[PDB]
Every structure is written in C-alpha cells, then in structure tokens.
Amino acid sequence: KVYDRCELARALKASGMDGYAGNSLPNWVCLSKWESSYNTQATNRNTDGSTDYGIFQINSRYWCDDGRTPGAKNVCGIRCSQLLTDDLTVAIRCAKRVVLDPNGIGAWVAWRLHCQNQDLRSYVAGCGV
C-alpha cells in the first residue's frame, strides 16, 4: 500500500510512535517519506547481498530473515515479507526494536541525510494530529 502522508501520520500516532524512545512523530513521517515514498512494498537490494524492506526500509542483514542474506541475524525475529504488508503492525514493532539500539533513529541513512536538524513541521501539517 502507498500511504497518504496524513494517513500514515495517524497510523503512527495510533501505534505509539509519537515520542517512541524520544523520537517525535514528524521524525517518523520524514524518514518514511525519503526511505520509501510511503510505499509498504518498497524493496531495495544492496551491494552486500542485503535488502531493505518496507515503508521504513529495514535491512535484512540484522533485523529480518529473507533467506538470501549472508551473515544475517534476524533480531526482530520475523520474515522480511511481513514488512511489506498494507497493515503496519509488524513493521512498527520492528522499527521500535531498531531505535532501542545505541544509534537510535541515526540508524536510518535517510533520516541522517534529510530529516536530522531540519524543520519537520511540514511533515505533519494539515493532519490534525
């Protein structure tokens, strides 16, 4: 599913993402926008054999099992195909687990690049959340 920006803001807010591990909601909408253009089915294969999955582009080397990634650890304990459903529950649970690591949301290159230190008010503007 390709989410509407505000539809996604509402689903993240309903799922407790607003302030999770200290990351306010605009952070999560900005990252989703630059990592997948709000498309839960986005996939991106990497030079290292790993693949990025879903709306949050979670990588198969450490968080999910796609069965074709060398030296994979599956910390979220899921199949990477569960990160591509229209229903965001498993993606949100795994993203929540990713930001508890020491690097926090800095784990996402798109966040470091386009959201870190920026005004992110536009990302939640007009969502009434």
Side-chain angles (χ1 to χ4, degrees), residues 28-96:
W28 300 106
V29 177
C30 181
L31 131 41
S32 295
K33 197 260 198 196
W34 301 102
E35 286 292 354
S36 64
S37 306
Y38 306 130
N39 188 5
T40 73
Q41 302 195 260
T43 65
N44 187 74
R45 165 85 143 285
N46 299 115
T47 76
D48 79 340
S50 74
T51 307
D52 301 325
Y53 293 95
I55 212 170
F56 305 121
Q57 294 283 277
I58 294 169
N59 184 264
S60 59
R61 190 155 95 109
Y62 317 90
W63 309 108
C64 57
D65 172 41
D66 69 356
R68 70 156 187 211
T69 314
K73 285 132 313 267
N74 200 12
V75 160
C76 286
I78 50 161
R79 302 280 205 210
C80 300
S81 60
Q82 305 181 245
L83 295 176
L84 305 172
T85 64
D86 306 326
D87 165 54
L88 275 64
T89 307
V90 169
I92 286 164
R93 168 171 336 193
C94 180
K96 287 175 179 172

Side-chain angles (χ1 to χ4, degrees), residues 21 23 63 97-108 111-112 116:
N23 302 109
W63 309 108
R97 166 67 184 77
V98 173
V99 286
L100 302 175
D101 264 18
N103 280 352
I105 197 165
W108 282 275
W111 181 91
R112 287 202 322 272
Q116 182 175 204

Side-chain angles (χ1 to χ4, degrees), residues 11-27:
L12 294 185
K13 169 77 133 168
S15 285
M17 295 291 260
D18 195 10
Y20 193 90
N23 302 109
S24 64
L25 193 77
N27 282 284

